[PDB]
């Protein structure tokens, strides 16, 4: 998260931290939508994933942590690495999380819920806080602006029905590497999933528009 601030610890209890193992491990964000399901981006998939719920400082084990293996990865069947269309994945956990003050689920939207350009939303994560900086040890958050789809026209086959365009280009505030898979919240509802953006971190970035994927989410949850 670039240009953000440290979250009040445990104020976003749905936040999930993903350690993905392939040798050396990669890292992503995600968020709890059911006690045993984490939503994230499709490009965070790997051979095995570990989810840590209840964290603020990811390097310090605390009382609030719940640390769970993923038993099944449900990547969207139409995900494509050329366009990164449908960059959405559901992770089924080995056991159900316990709901506490520090671990909770985030509602996801109705398909009719189409969030327009112009409004301010919030995204959080443990990613890099600059182009050349390390991942943040502590969960960080930033307020960003939803942009007209025209401002993401430099991105390949940007599709407004599928994808949100996030981050006023006149500012430096942005999600970045490591934030991928994390939720974008507008008025308390998960509307977006951090997907991708420019290597130089110049906003806006592309988020998956969760509302479009509501029926696909339904079919995964009901079969599992």
């Amino acid at each position: 998260i670039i240009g953000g601030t440290e979250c009040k610890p445990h104020s976003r209890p749905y936040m999930a931290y993903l350690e993905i193992v392939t040798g050396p491990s990669k890292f992503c964000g995600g968020f709890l939508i059911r006690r045993n399901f984490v939503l994230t981006a499709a490009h965070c998939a790997g051979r095995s994933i570990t989810v840590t719920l209840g964290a603020h400082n990811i390097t310090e084990e605390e009382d609030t942590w719940q640390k769970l293996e993923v038993i099944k990865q449900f990547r969207h069947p139409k995900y494509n690495t050329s366009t990164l269309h449908h960059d959405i994945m559901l992770l089924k956990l080995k056991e159900k999380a316990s709901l506490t003050l520090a671990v909770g689920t985030l509602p996801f939207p109705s398909q009719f819920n189409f969030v327009p350009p112009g409004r301010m939303c919030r995204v959080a994560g443990w990613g890099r806080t600059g182009v050349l900086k390390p991942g943040s040890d502590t969960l960080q958050e930033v307020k960003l602006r939803l942009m007209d789809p025209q401002a993401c026209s430099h991105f390949r086959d940007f599709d407004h029905n599928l994808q949100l365009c996030v981050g006023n280009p006149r500012k430096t505030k942005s999600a970045f590497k490591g934030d991928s898979g994390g939720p974008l919240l507008c008025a308390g509802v998960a509307q977006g999933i951090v997907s991708y953006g420019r290597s130089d971190a110049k906003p806006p970035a592309v988020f998956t528009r969760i509302s479009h994927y509501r029926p696909w989410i339904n079919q995964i949850l009901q079969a599992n």
Partner: protein, 61 residues
């Protein structure tokens, strides 16, 4: 293990993609889905997408 070698330098434009140098070796983790491949660099240990035409199979493994 599937090893490929870069034939050209490449500078990533999307944060999901690796930057690399002609001659660098890669373990390919998935051939897609699509024309960008998930790969781990044997030089830097980073994981990400690489354009498939910038690389070629190593001679023998």
């Amino acid at each position: 293990v599937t090893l490929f070698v870069a034939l050209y330098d490449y500078n990533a434009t999307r944060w999901t993609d690796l930057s690399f140098h002609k001659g660098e070796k890669f373990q390919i983790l998935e051939f897609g889905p699509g024309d960008w491949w998930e790969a781990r660099s044997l030089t830097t240990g980073e994981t990400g997408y690489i354009p498939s035409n910038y690389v070629a199979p190593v001679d023998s493994i």
